[PDB]
Design an enzyme around this catalytic site. Structure first.
Site, mmCIF file in Angstrom:
data_model
loop_
_atom_site.group_PDB
_atom_site.id
_atom_site.type_symbol
_atom_site.label_atom_id
_atom_site.label_comp_id
_atom_site.label_asym_id
_atom_site.label_seq_id
_atom_site.Cartn_x
_atom_site.Cartn_y
_atom_site.Cartn_z
ATOM 1 N N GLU A 54 -7.595 4.785 7.392
ATOM 2 C CA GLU A 54 -7.387 6.189 7.009
ATOM 3 C C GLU A 54 -8.624 6.810 6.347
ATOM 4 O O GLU A 54 -8.923 7.993 6.552
ATOM 5 C CB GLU A 54 -6.143 6.322 6.123
ATOM 6 C CG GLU A 54 -4.858 6.250 6.946
ATOM 7 C CD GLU A 54 -3.635 5.810 6.178
ATOM 8 O OE1 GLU A 54 -2.658 5.430 6.856
ATOM 9 O OE2 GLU A 54 -3.636 5.844 4.921
ATOM 10 N N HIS A 97 -9.947 0.905 4.470
ATOM 11 C CA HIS A 97 -8.689 1.275 5.130
ATOM 12 C C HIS A 97 -8.996 2.287 6.224
ATOM 13 O O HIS A 97 -9.779 3.228 5.995
ATOM 14 C CB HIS A 97 -7.673 1.872 4.155
ATOM 15 C CG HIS A 97 -6.283 1.936 4.714
ATOM 16 N ND1 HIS A 97 -5.859 2.948 5.550
ATOM 17 C CD2 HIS A 97 -5.229 1.095 4.580
ATOM 18 C CE1 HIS A 97 -4.602 2.736 5.895
ATOM 19 N NE2 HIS A 97 -4.195 1.618 5.317
ATOM 20 N N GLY A 146 0.139 4.633 15.699
ATOM 21 C CA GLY A 146 0.236 6.028 16.142
ATOM 22 C C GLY A 146 -0.227 6.281 17.569
ATOM 23 O O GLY A 146 -0.692 7.378 17.890
ATOM 24 N N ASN A 165 0.842 -1.189 0.000
ATOM 25 C CA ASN A 165 0.000 0.000 0.000
ATOM 26 C C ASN A 165 0.881 1.244 0.000
ATOM 27 O O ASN A 165 1.341 1.699 1.058
ATOM 28 C CB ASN A 165 -0.980 0.015 1.188
ATOM 29 C CG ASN A 165 -1.899 1.244 1.176
ATOM 30 O OD1 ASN A 165 -1.937 2.002 0.198
ATOM 31 N ND2 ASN A 165 -2.627 1.462 2.285
ATOM 32 N N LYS A 172 0.017 4.169 -0.418
ATOM 33 C CA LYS A 172 -0.766 5.292 0.095
ATOM 34 C C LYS A 172 -0.593 6.502 -0.830
ATOM 35 O O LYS A 172 -0.512 6.329 -2.051
ATOM 36 C CB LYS A 172 -0.424 5.582 1.573
ATOM 37 C CG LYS A 172 -0.559 4.330 2.465
ATOM 38 C CD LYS A 172 -0.497 4.663 3.955
ATOM 39 C CE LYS A 172 -0.642 3.397 4.813
ATOM 40 N NZ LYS A 172 -0.653 3.717 6.271
ATOM 41 N N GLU A 221 -6.189 -4.429 10.939
ATOM 42 C CA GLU A 221 -5.417 -3.252 11.322
ATOM 43 C C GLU A 221 -5.526 -3.023 12.828
ATOM 44 O O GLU A 221 -6.594 -2.637 13.312
ATOM 45 C CB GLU A 221 -5.932 -2.013 10.594
ATOM 46 C CG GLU A 221 -5.886 -2.092 9.083
ATOM 47 C CD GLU A 221 -6.202 -0.748 8.456
ATOM 48 O OE1 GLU A 221 -7.399 -0.422 8.316
ATOM 49 O OE2 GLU A 221 -5.250 -0.011 8.123
ATOM 50 N N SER A 276 2.264 -2.421 11.611
ATOM 51 C CA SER A 276 3.578 -2.074 11.076
ATOM 52 C C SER A 276 4.391 -3.317 10.690
ATOM 53 O O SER A 276 4.684 -4.172 11.531
ATOM 54 C CB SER A 276 4.352 -1.171 12.039
ATOM 55 O OG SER A 276 5.373 -0.482 11.330
#
Lengths: 247, 246
Positions: A96, A94, A170, A9, A11, A164, A210
């Site tokens: 995001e 996703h 984060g 990905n 992004k 995910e 990650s």
């Protein structure tokens, strides 16, 4: 046995020049696409460039797809349009897009429905937040997210799940390969009970936390982890070593 | 002002239909120094479309990210557009405000990102049926324009589009006279906020229903500088809409 599935990905990253350099390095890796799925997901406007540079052993896809069909939907890319261009895969849900663009479980369902109607393969993302994990709601949250769309799956080779761990993205927290494995097994059980045993043993479930050259082997060796949706590491020439771990 | 005729293909097209359509477009001999003719294909159709269209045609994309490069799965940054020499972007199209909850602040940030990267912006706004029936047209459009207008530092590079949402899919119809009045109102707003020279320089396009029949009645209006055309721009007869501006 489930075919392993390694996805890049990219992004919102890339230039024509950087993609030329990266794809060239990717092409240097010899692998058998009949035994391993390796999929690259460039930005939409890079797709043409990316597809032409990558040898066919690499599969290709786009990072999002419209919940609507063709028509008056300025800025959207329909499943029908993707199919006509022979775009093989789409990413749906996703985190995001759930975060910045308020994509809902229902949006994810409708995107999956459109994708499958138009004979696309779908990479579908979900996962619980730090607050949700801290409240011990992991299974409840993932159950709801999966049940939003799972009944739409007909061919269990063509829909690929992505866990995910938002609680470890984060937040300052990190997920061990074992902790990922535990959730993956839970996901497979949910598919088993909502869809069926054969179906669950068939479906690919990818890790979407990650992933780098140092931890990929520890991740892939887990019984219920079938590959990864890889972020920043997939923008590096060393991504080939991440592919190697699944070989 | 230089007339500006834009084809918003929205979410439509196949490799084959674009081949046919661009070929028909190429048959029209126009001078791109006399009028701007911009084609906005779907993102994944951009390369195909740019290659097929002759150099006289300008091109753009139908949306751009409010974020830069980075972890924004599914988005196309202004930086990426610049690297590809994608000339124009559409910002704030009512379909994005409607289906994807794009806000005035989003429009401002997208314009900022676009100008930073030397992209020319086609910025859309307009009032609903409810707003018009309540005589809120000027209030609504003033607010929408003021969300972003102070960012314009070159009045050839930002192009305004009035979308009469009250006349889009409502059963109601906008007359060229009604459209002209709004355009006049819009230019006055730009004058109030940016100055007279700037107001007289900026293109303000009509974004309501435009076809081969009505195009001349619209563009001949004093304050209507062209159009963002919808489904009529998916037809070979679109050349006749371009002709109204020639």
């Amino acid at each position: 046995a489930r075919k392993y599935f390694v996805a890049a990905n990219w992004k919102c990253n890339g230039t024509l020049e950087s993609i030329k350099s990266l794809t060239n390095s990717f092409n240097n890796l010899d692998f058998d696409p009949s035994k391993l799925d390796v999929v690259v997901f460039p930005v939409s406007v890079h797709y043409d460039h990316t597809r032409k540079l990558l040898q066919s052993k690499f599969s290709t896809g786009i990072q999002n797809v419209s919940k609507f069909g063709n028509g008056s939907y300025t800025g959207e890319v329909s499943a029908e349009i993707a199919k006509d261009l022979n775009i093989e895969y789409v990413i749906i849900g996703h985190h995001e897009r759930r975060k910045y663009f308020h994509e809902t479980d229902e949006d994810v369902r409708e995107k999956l429905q459109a994708s499958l109607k138009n004979n696309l393969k779908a990479v579908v993302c979900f996962g619980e937040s730090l607050e949700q994990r801290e409240q011990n709601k992991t299974i409840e949250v993932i159950t709801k997210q999966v049940k939003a769309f799972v009944d739409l799956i007909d061919n269990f080779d063509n829909v690929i799940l992505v866990y995910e761990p938002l609680w470890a993205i984060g937040t300052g927290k990190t997920a061990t390969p074992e902790q990922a494995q535990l959730v993956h097994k839970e996901i497979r059980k949910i598919v088993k009970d909502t869809c069926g045993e054969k179906q669950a043993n068939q479906i690919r479930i990818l890790y979407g936390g990650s992933v780098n050259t140092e931890n990929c082997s520890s991740l892939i060796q887990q019984e219920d982890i079938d590959g990864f949706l890889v972020g920043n590491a997939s923008l590096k020439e060393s991504f080939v070593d991440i592919i190697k771990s699944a070989m």
